[PDB]
């Protein structure tokens, strides 16, 4: 997202406004305002690693924009929007993740490698791979009888088609010591 | 749901795995290690587009 | 299938480590364990 000091009314603010957002969700209901539309209206930009060197990004828009003029204890400890220099803003920080890691529920609550493990195992998890399975001759095909969408989901799965084509079932799980088996 | 991006070659679906490489036409300076006559080198891997 | 069409190979200083420059471009978790660890990047 592009951020500009350019705002008659107040501070440095993200070009994209609640009007563009509804302008997009209008097109979301139609299935005229595409991604290209945000790109040509210079609201959003493409930044490679070399260019990244010279920019300054905010993680959250709203949380990292207007300054201070009680606090929930259960929430994680967050930093501030000290920067008045902000050139860009992060669309969503969860987007730093790839296809496999994007199915991990609360990966921000796991030890680093446990996440690295899941993004390797899910590749070996059974489920419906394609709906046309019955019409194709492949060496080996494994299809789950009764696949279930997960009760705990990621906003990113929407795009990953995961709830439409799942890799498991929601099992009733007890974490207990039983027969020692 | 099938996204494409693959090829069908003599029956089988083949993926062209993206191959990482260092960018060319790039000026880079490196300190050549303790036992060396040359102390530093400026390299440019020049190649045509 | 999806994660296979976003796979990167790196053949042959400290390549296996997750670099700062990998932020937002490559997945910090999706990499193999053993031999290819950190040489197989996922977008």
């Amino acid at each position: 997202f592009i951020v500009e000091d350019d705002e008659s009314l107040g501070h440095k603010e993200l070009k994209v406004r609640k009007g563009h957002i509804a302008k997009l969700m209008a097109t979301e209901y139609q299935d005229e305002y595409t991604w290209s539309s945000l790109l040509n209206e210079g609201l959003v930009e493409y930044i490679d690693a070399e260019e990244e060197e010279s920019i300054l990004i905010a993680m959250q828009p709203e949380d990292l924009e207007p300054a201070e003029a009680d606090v929930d204890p259960a929430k994680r400890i967050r930093v501030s929007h000290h920067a008045t220099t902000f050139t860009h803003c992060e669309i969503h920080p969860s987007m730093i993740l790839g296809v496999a890691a994007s199915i991990i529920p609360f990966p921000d609550h796991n030890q680093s490698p446990r996440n690295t493990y899941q993004s390797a195992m899910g590749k070996q998890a059974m489920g419906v791979f394609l709906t046309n399975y019955n019409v194709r001759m492949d060496t080996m095909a494994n299809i789950l009888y009764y696949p279930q969408k997960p009760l705990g989901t990621t906003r990113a799965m929407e795009y990953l088609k995961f709830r439409e084509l799942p890799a498991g079932q929601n099992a009733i799980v007890a974490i207990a010591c039983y027969s020692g088996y | 749901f099938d996204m494409g991006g693959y090829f069908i070659i003599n029956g089988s679906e083949k993926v062209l795995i993206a191959q990482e490489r260092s960018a060319g036409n790039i000026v880079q300076v490196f300190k050549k290690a303790a036992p060396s006559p040359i102390s530093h080198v400026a390299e440019i891997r020049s190649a045509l587009e | 299938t999806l994660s296979h069409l976003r796979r990167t190979n790196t053949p042959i200083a400290k390549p296996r480590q997750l670099h700062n420059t990998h932020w937002g471009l490559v997945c910090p978790a999706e990499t193999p364990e053993g031999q290819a660890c950190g040489l197989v990047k996922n977008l």
Binding site: L14, G19, L24, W35, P61, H92, Y159 | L16 | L5
Partner: peptide
């Protein structure tokens, strides 16, 4: 109020559009 600042939930409306257009194998195809 069509020029009001964007919230955190609104970033998903942009992400929706990114994928509506590009898809997941954008790079392989392009």
């Amino acid at each position: 109020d069509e020029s009001a600042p964007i919230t955190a939930e609104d970033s998903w409306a942009v992400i929706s559009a990114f994928f509506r257009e590009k898809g997941l194998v954008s790079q392989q195809l392009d």
